[PDB]
Amino acid sequence: DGYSLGDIAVDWATVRVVGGDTYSLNADRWGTLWPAATAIPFYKPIDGQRVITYFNPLYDNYEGYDHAVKVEHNYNVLTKQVEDLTAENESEFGNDPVWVNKDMMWIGGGYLNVIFRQNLKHLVSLVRDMRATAAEGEDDGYIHLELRYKTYDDQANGAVSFNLNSLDLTGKKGIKVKLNSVKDGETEVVFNLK
Amino acid sequence: DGYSLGDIAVDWATVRVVGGDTYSLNADRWGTLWPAATAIPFYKPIDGQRVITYFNPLYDNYEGYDHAVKVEHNYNVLTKQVEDLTAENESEFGNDPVWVNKDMMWIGGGYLNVIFRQNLKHLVSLVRDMRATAAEGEDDGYIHLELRYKTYDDQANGAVSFNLNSLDLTGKKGIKVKLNSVKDGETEVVFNLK
Numbered sequence: 001d002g003y004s005l006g007d008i009a010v011d012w013a014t015v016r017v018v019g020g021d022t023y024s025l026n027a028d029r030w031g032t033l034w035p036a037a038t039a040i041p042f043y044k045p046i047d048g049q050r051v052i053t054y055f056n057p058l059y060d061n062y063e064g065y066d067h068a069v070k071v072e073h074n075y076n077v078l079t080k081q082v083e084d085l086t087a088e089n090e091s092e093f094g095n096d097p098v099w100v101n102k103d104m105m106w107i108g109g110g111y112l113n114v115i116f117r118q119n120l121k122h123l124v125s126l127v128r129d130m131r132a133t134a135a136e137g138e139d140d141g142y143i144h145l146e147l148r149y150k151t152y153d154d155q156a157n158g159a160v161s162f163n164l165n166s167l168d169l170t171g172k173k174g175i176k177v178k179l180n181s182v183k184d185g186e187t188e189v190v191f192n193l194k
Numbered sequence: 195d196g197y198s199l200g201d202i203a204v205d206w207a208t209v210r211v212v213g214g215d216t217y218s219l220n221a222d223r224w225g226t227l228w229p230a231a232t233a234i235p236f237y238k239p240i241d242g243q244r245v246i247t248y249f250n251p252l253y254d255n256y257e258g259y260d261h262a263v264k265v266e267h268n269y270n271v272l273t274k275q276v277e278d279l280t281a282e283n284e285s286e287f288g289n290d291p292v293w294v295n296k297d298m299m300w301i302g303g304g305y306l307n308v309i310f311r312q313n314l315k316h317l318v319s320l321v322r323d324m325r326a327t328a329a330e331g332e333d334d335g336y337i338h339l340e341l342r343y344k345t346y347d348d349q350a351n352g353a354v355s356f357n358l359n360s361l362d363l364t365g366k367k368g369i370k371v372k373l374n375s376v377k378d379g380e381t382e383v384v385f386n387l388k
Contacts, residue, residue, distance in 0.1 A: 086230040
């Protein structure tokens with residue numbers, strides 16, 4: 001391609017472990033990234049860990065990988081599943097009013113990616129009401145999830161990635177995510193799929 | 195805050211020119227950024243230019259700015275308005291089937307931000323049908339836009355930012371954006387606002 005050695009790029013990715021301490025990154029937009037070089041040789045990879053990865057792209061189609069790069073930073077992102085909300089845990093997740101305009105939420109690489117302002121004592125969850133009462137998805141064609149934030153002893157920050165591959169999107173128009181906005185109360189966000 | 199000199203961060207931002215070659219960045223998530231230092235002293239700022247900015251955060255609440263930082267890179271992003279589609283220009287914008295899963299679109303800092311895979315001979319537009327026939331927004335409460343891509347002499351790449359402040363969101367549920375997907379044909383994307 002047209003790359004320079006000075007150039008930097010970023011993406012969110014999933015770490016794939018090759019052999020002991022050798023790893024590749026499966027990036028949402030850039031695809032698979034082989035670390036031909038690195039500024040962090042003592043980085044300990046965990047299979048399935050989501051990260052924000054900063055890297056200098058070098059080549060394309062390198063030994064079965066979409067790109068070879070020099071990794072500069074791998075900031076670990078909290079990696080979680082969609083959790084079923086039941087009678088047993090209905091009160092466990094909280095619902096603090098937390099969302100502002102500088103928060104950002106999107107679907108990439110099979111995950112719901114969330115960043116509250118910056119990555120630089122709380123519980124953040126993505127839940128699905130499976131209780132007897134919940135017939136909301138029934139009669140609209142969307143999967144209904146809710147993002148829940150909870151504080152302990154008192155301004156939200158951080159980043160999280162929720163694996164969405166536990167859901168069945170067959171005959172579904174998409175996914176809906178309910179947010180508790182600080183100013184606007186409960187609001188909906190609609191993700192049409194395909 | 196808890197920053198290191200080794201740390202890097204990224205955001206999308208709007209350049210604000212202070213005096214000749216001195217500038218600040220108005221970042222979608224991080225807020226206003228003062229360049230206390232830089233790795234690009236010969237960078238020529240243009241007021242209103244949108245950029246992807248890479249920077250090392252240093253301080254908070256520095257002289258009226260939300261942060262002081264060292265700027266590392268400012269990759270210029272194509273910056274455009276929402277264009278009214280009329281009888282005069284109906285055929286001017288094209289509609290190539292272009293969208294894939296590795297493309298990404300979101301609203302940040304008053305702009306519709308689009309990146310086709312990577313920033314590393316085409317026309318990309320965000321248009322609004324103002325022709326006599328268009329009564330689609332009438333009777334659903336959303337503003338209806340369409341993202342249009344066009345090639346000349348034959349795989350989409352790049353990044354663009356569309357200013358949305360020309361639109362009136364009063365009594366509106368949000369904005370809808372129509373995409374031409376390669377696999378799925380015309381598809382809708384829904385942005386609920388507030």
